[PDB]
Amino acid sequence: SWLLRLFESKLFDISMAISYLYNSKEPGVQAYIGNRLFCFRNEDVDFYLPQLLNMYIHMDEDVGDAIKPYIVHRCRQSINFSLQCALLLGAYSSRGTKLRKLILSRLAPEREFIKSLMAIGKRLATLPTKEQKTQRLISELSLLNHKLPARVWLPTAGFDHHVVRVPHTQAVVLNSKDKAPYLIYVEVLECENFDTTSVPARIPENVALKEPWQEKVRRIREGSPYGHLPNWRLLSVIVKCGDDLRQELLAFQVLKQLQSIWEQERVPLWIKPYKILVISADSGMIEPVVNAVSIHQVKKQSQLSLLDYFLQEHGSYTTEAFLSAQRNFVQSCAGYCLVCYLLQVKDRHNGNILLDAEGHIIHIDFGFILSSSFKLTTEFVDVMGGLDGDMFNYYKMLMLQGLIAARKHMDKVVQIVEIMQQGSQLPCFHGSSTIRNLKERFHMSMTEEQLQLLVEQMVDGSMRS
Amino acid sequence: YDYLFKVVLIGDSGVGKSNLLSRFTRNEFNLESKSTIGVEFATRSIQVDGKTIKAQIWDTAGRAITSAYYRGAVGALLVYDIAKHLTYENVERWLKELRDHADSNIVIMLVGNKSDLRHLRAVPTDEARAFAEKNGLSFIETSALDSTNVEAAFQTILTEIYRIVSQ
Numbered sequence: 001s002w003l004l005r006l007f008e009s010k011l012f013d014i015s016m017a018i019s020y021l022y023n024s025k026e027p028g029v030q031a032y033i034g035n036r037l038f039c040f041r042n043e044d045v046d047f048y049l050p051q052l053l054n055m056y057i058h059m060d061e062d063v064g065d066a067i068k069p070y071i072v073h074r075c076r077q078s079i080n081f082s083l084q085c086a087l088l089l090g091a092y093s094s095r096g097t098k099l100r101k102l103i104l105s106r107l108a109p110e111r112e113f114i115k116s117l118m119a120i121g122k123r124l125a126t127l128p129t130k131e132q133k134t135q136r137l138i139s140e141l142s143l144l145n146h147k148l149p150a151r152v153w154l155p156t157a158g159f160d161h162h163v164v165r166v167p168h169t170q171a172v173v174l175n176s177k178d179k180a181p182y183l184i185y186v187e188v189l190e191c192e193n194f195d196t197t198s199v200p201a202r203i204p205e206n207v208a209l210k211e212p213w214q215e216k217v218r219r220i221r222e223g224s225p226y227g228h229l230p231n232w233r234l235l236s237v238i239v240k241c242g243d244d245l246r247q248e249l250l251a252f253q254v255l256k257q258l259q260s261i262w263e264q265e266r267v268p269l270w271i272k273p274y275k276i277l278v279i280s281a282d283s284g285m286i287e288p289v290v291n292a293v294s295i296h297q298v299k300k301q302s303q304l305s306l307l308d309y310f311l312q313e314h315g316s317y318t319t320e321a322f323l324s325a326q327r328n329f330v331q332s333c334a335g336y337c338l339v340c341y342l343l344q345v346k347d348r349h350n351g352n353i354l355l356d357a358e359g360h361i362i363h364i365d366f367g368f369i370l371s372s373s374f375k376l377t378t379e380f381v382d383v384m385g386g387l388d389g390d391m392f393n394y395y396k397m398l399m400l401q402g403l404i405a406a407r408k409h410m411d412k413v414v415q416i417v418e419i420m421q422q423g424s425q426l427p428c429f430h431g432s433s434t435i436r437n438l439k440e441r442f443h444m445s446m447t448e449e450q451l452q453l454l455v456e457q458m459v460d461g462s463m464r465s
Numbered sequence: 466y467d468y469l470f471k472v473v474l475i476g477d478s479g480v481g482k483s484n485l486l487s488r489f490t491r492n493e494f495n496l497e498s499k500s501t502i503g504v505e506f507a508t509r510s511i512q513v514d515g516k517t518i519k520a521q522i523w524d525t526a527g528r529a530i531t532s533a534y535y536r537g538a539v540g541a542l543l544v545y546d547i548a549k550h551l552t553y554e555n556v557e558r559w560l561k562e563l564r565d566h567a568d569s570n571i572v573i574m575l576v577g578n579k580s581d582l583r584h585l586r587a588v589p590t591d592e593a594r595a596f597a598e599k600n601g602l603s604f605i606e607t608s609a610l611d612s613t614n615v616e617a618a619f620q621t622i623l624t625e626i627y628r629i630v631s632q
């Protein structure tokens with residue numbers, strides 16, 4: 001009864017549930033938990049959907065059979081949920097197949113919507129320059145619009161909705177590569193529930209530049225047929241037709257937990273998880289951060305040093321706008337430094353770091369992490385006011401605080417990674433001791449004085465280049 | 466922002482340093498508490514005698530080594546809990562402290578916090594103010610909980626500071 005005591009206590013959450021489900025070899029416990037999933041809030045369980053579905057595929061039938069009933073239940077009350085399941089089910093098996101087909105067995109409008117987006121991207125491969133690609137895209141997006149507002153939605157959206165219109169002229173391609181990703185803007189009419197609501201009616205139709213997000217909404221809105229409606233909102237997604245997003249999703253989950261951990265404790269680190277959508281092992285979409293551009297290009301259009309740009313765009317050292325931006329810089333630096341360290345993120349350069357209009361940095365390309373095989377340049381240190389600076393000392397103070405916080409909730413983090421490693425061929429799990437090395441990096445045995453030194457050492461390392 | 470005044474908060478653990486900072490700068494308080502690990506930073510701008518200043522407040526800890534942030538501080542709020550005599554008792558050692566690691570010409574305010582705990586008072590206002598003028602410190606009692614004198618405390622020390630006008 002001592003076990004059952006815990007499961008019936010307040011201490012029992014979806015996190016704990018999955019852990020026992022993952023670890024317990026007792027079929028009685030597995031089945032017990034399978035049933036208890038229903039009592040939890042839909043939102044809480046959703047976050048762990050990749051784990052649940054992974055277990056289903058790669059674990060003993062007993063474990064699977066306990067999870068399935070809950071999944072089917074959700075699938076039956078939400079096609080969004082249905083969609084995300086089917087996509088995940090497929091991507092993570094290359095046991096799964098039986099259930100995927102049953103779920104897909106309705107979604108045809110959406111799957112064709114998604115198919116076309118993927119199809120588009122693959123065609124642009126024959127156009128060897130960036131802007132050549134852009135023009136074919138813009139043209140071809142216009143063909144999408146010919147399809148009326150459809151019984152399709154962007155799973156990457158925070159809410160339920162119908163897609164009505166694609167402002168094709170605003171879309172842009174992000175690089176010149178063979179299977180280049182591309183950014184698009186999408187118009188939607190919000191729902192209260194997708195599953196019960198009539199597709200909106202067509203409203204007959206009749207320039208793109210560098211601008212803030214709210215200025216872009218104005219311009220797109222004003223031009224749009226549906227723009228007058230209060231129901232109307234603008235979304236955005238990056239489409240990756242030939243890039244795997246399964247590592248990207250994993251990192252996202254890790255970032256989200258760490259975000260919650262640092263939120264739960266009172267450490268004012270700052271980071272920004274961006275939503276991920278796995279479509280295949282081949283392909284996915286990303287919800288982009290608005291009002292942000294790469295550091296590298298920030299330096300190419302400005303011709304300035306990082307510090308100088310801050311001063312230009314926000315103000316002199318005596319201004320509020322600057323000090324706010326500096327603070328946001330320092331806090332976002334400490335956050336992402338810690339994330340880079342814990343996940344062992346590599347391939348770190350100014351192409352992979354974004355700067356938002358408030359001064360936060362944001363890392364983005366999470367290939368090369370963990371077993372798969374961060375820089376504190378003086379340009380970054382300058383913005384912080386220099387090594388002797390109080391704000392720089394504070395940067396070090398935040399890192400320690402955020403490290404101490406992470407240790408207090410280490411298990412929530414390792415859980416996320418350790419389950420995913422299951423039966424996994426991701427390059428990040430290439431090692432024999434991927435999860436084991438991860439735990440060592442938390443230094444759970446260390447005293448805080450020891451951690452101060454380690455933090456000092458970390459910073460010293462980050463400067464060598 | 467005309468000026469920039471750096472101020473530190475120091476004192477025994479539990480006296481309310483961290484809540485003083487959150488009340489004064491974000492107008493927030495909490496009964497549940499997390500011990501301050503190292504240092505915490507918050508900022509707010511005010512006007513004294515017609516002049517716009519900006520204060521950078523540092524919430525230190527009761528992790529003994531927070532010393533470094535002291536340097537280049539014009540003012541320091543040294544806080545004790547009125548309802549816990551020991552915290553007032555160590556104020557003598559806390560003044561010997563400032564006379565080791567900080568500017569010998571720094572503005573100090575003695576602060577009795579948690580004045581709302583009327584019935585638990587373990588340090589009489591007279592005894593405190595006596596020590597206050599026995600020394601070279603300014604003195605006030607605050608409650609972070611009800612926000613009594615919290616604004617006053619900052620505005621006092623900042624005004625006192627500005628009285629260092631150079632000719």
Ligand SMILES: COc1ccc(-c2c(C)nc3c(NCCNC(C)=O)cc(Cl)nn23)cc1S(=O)(=O)N[C@H]1CC[C@H](N)CC1
Pocket residue numbers: 174175181182212213236238240274286287288289290291292293294351352354364365366
């Ligand atoms: C790993 O891959 C990722 C990961 C994250 C993102 C992403 C997100 C979430 N947010 C933005 C963003 N924000 C500005 C949006 N502007 C407005 C106003 O909405 C601009 C850009 Cl460039 N990326 N980005 C994109 C990609 S990727 O698939 O495109 N590969 C990139 C292509 C550009 C190369 N420099 C790096 C590698």
Ligand SMILES: Nc1nc2c(ncn2[C@@H]2O[C@H](COP(=O)(O)OP(=O)(O)OP(O)(O)=S)[C@@H](O)[C@H]2O)c(=O)[nH]1
Pocket residue numbers: 476477478479480481482483484485495496497498499500501502525526527578579580581582607608609610611
């Ligand atoms: N009744 C009353 N209780 C207070 C007051 N201020 C703080 N408390 C309590 O005292 C405790 C002080 O915690 P804290 O906010 O960290 O200040 P501090 O102790 O000076 O800072 P620290 O070095 O220990 S982290 C809090 O639990 C808080 O609930 C107050 O003004 N009135």
